Amino acid sequence: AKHRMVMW
């Protein structure tokens, strides 16, 4: 479930 902390 964890999202890489990219689309930022």
Place this chain on the structure above:
Amino acid sequence: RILPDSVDWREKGCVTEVKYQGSCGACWAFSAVGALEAQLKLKTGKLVSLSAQNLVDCSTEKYGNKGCNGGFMTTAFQYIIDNKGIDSDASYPYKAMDQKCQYDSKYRAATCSKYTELPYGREDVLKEAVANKGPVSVGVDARHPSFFLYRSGVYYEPSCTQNVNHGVLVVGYGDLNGKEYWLVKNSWGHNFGEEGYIRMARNKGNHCGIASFPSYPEI
């Protein structure tokens, strides 16, 4: 067990100055080194900024991380364990870009022996860890202008989700006239928020996912 009503690890000498990540998505790396900095102080009595750049350049694809394009605090910790060290920030300073791995054990400033992941959504367990173990690395949902524009007070955003996208460091908790909050160290410099910190709503249903994926290292 009894827990303090409020905690602030800055008052215990376990928190380094606020850092500025620039146009590099290295918040995960800053979160990870901030958590370990507190444990280094608790073990050795020394307060030393550790190299976020070391993680950006060296905790890469084998750890699921993509440097300035994001990563994970947990696998940052695993790199420090595997590598038997992380360099000081002074020796391996932050450049806000992806570089070749330049780790040198000559300048090792800390080690890491283990890390612990806390259960999804459990703000009570996060509170226990902050009180009794130290600052805790967490993700938050930061993809809201209200987050970047925050100036002071307790932050609450109705549009927030429990899906995290930004790594930060819980260094305490408290209440502002009974509004409970998490004291959160960011890596957007001193001009973000309250001298680089944001107080985020606590016990409001895992607000912005603050307790979705907490973890902390030990030495």
